[PDB]
Amino acid sequence: SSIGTGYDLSASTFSPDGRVFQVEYAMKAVENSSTAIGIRCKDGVVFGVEKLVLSKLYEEGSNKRLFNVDRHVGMAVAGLLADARSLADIAREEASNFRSNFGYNIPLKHLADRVAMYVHAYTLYSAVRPFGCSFMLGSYSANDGAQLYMIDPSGVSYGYWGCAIGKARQAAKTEIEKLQMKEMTCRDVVKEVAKIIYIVHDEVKDKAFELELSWVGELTKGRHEIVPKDIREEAEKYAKESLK
Template sequence: MSGRVGESSSRRRRTAAKPPRCDRSITVFSPEGRVFQVDYARNSVKLEGITSVAVRGADSVCVITQRTKAPADPLLDTADPAFMHLFQITERLGMLATGMPADGRALAQQARNEAAGFRHKWGYEMPPKMLAQWLGDRAQVRTQHAGMRPYRVVATVVGIDEEKGTPDLFTCDPAGQVLGHKATSVGLKDQEAIEFLEEAMAANSSLSFQETMEMAVSALRHVLEDNSQGHDIEVGVVRKNYPIFRTVLRRIYKNPLAGQSILDGEGQ
């Protein structure tokens, strides 16, 4: 009798320790109405340890991100695309993937295929908003099927809308929510960067091309740690009068030297 009682108590303890199904399944809501696996995917974007910033000006968009720190392996080629977060989707469309690099590359390749198919079918460039909405649809589907997991990445889409002739900036999160922005930040210290942008852009949100780049770099520099060796970053820009998405690698410092341009640095 005592053995059965002990066995029953042990079973109850195991049952009590088992996490609820809503905490393990992508298809089950919690009692509070949340999908925990989607929340975990959002939070895991910060685990990459980098911060990204994007700013939309009057005639341009600038996206900027820290590079993923290479593992302590002297034989690794740190110039390899495995460490990159900026992707050229078409000649005129760019995407910044903040989060797991492997998920970012997979999402970028799917976006390239979709944009190429759109151009072949309709004869013109896929608008940035439409690409962002397509990415959102892809992400949202992965929150409904138990055999999938959400992407561990936030995609930032930039480009010039050919019909309106205006710069566009959108983000798509792991839940599939698509939002347009004047400026935004994603990653480890996103809230600090957003607060900086809100204050800095309160007086003037219609920025020139140079001001747009400086605003993005200043916001990222605001959240960086003081490091004498500097920080390697990726910069992507697209302009109305030259609507080609271009990327460049730079090294910036928390406190630049007097007279140094905000984008002066090493690497090209």
């Protein structure tokens, strides 16, 4: 799994054991970034990201790793932020073209598939490199309910009840399995998303961090919105008090 001349220098080159290492190294880039979490509840989807404070000279809400793709779709990114931002634009544009062509809001399953196909296109050629980021897409409606999809550098999309991507993604998933989610309201999910972030965050490794939350569901009438200052602070109190 570490052979010499070539094999891993190009995305257009298979290794003897049939692997595209350039895609796997782009996944290594997302594994080195901080954790992003998303839970699908009975009436919506909630996102959480441990935004790492690199310098105390940055403002609050700087380097948003939470995005609005469409008025009903949210995006939580992990990995190389520059590539994540450009993938948000593709996501936005595909969501924009759908409305202009057909009239209604793009279905999340269809939106995920179209963006995932775009990610995949960047894994076949020597002329381009794979995106070094994983991202999640959350939506809610009266007809379809809560839906959550995740897309990795390879171009694979899957539906999730709960999903984590980043530094301690496997450590976070063991904490998500403790939650019922299916019979939980999103009012109490924000509460839970907060603490899992505080648990997984390594205090001695990474010094300073800020918690970012967003949600889309019944409570927000189908729109993807930022979790208000009042609600975020109540959840962060639950995170620090359950630290005992």
